[PDB]
């Protein structure tokens, strides 16, 4: 029950720190003290990308799946950021369902 706060780009996200290292990604390697990670003085984690899917992303951590979104585009910045913070199972099902788009 020990939580975080994370600054994703501006975005402000609370979470729990089993959620950040639940899986093996580089959430898990920043809360593990693996890599350097930078902090303001309110005690937010500073995160220099943009939070938009930022929220999908702590879904798929915590509860293991998540509903992707429809259109190619939003697909593509979700997938891109699954990649950011090497979410393996999320990155997967983005794949799946662009291609899936392309069929036809
Ligand atoms: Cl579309």
Request: aromatic residues 8%.
């Amino acid at each position: 029950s020990k939580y975080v706060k994370l600054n994703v780009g501006g975005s402000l996200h609370y979470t729990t720190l089993r959620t950040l290292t639940g899986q093996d990604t580089m959430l898990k390697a920043m809360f593990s003290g693996r890599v350097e990670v930078l902090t303001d003085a309110g005690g937010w984690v500073l995160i220099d990308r943009s939070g938009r899917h930022f929220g999908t992303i702590l879904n798929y951590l915590r509860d293991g799946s998540v509903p992707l979104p429809e259109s190619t585009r939003e697909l593509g910045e979700l997938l891109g950021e699954a990649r950011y913070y090497l979410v393996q199972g999320l990155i997967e099902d983005c794949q799946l369902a662009l291609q899936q788009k392309r069929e036809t």
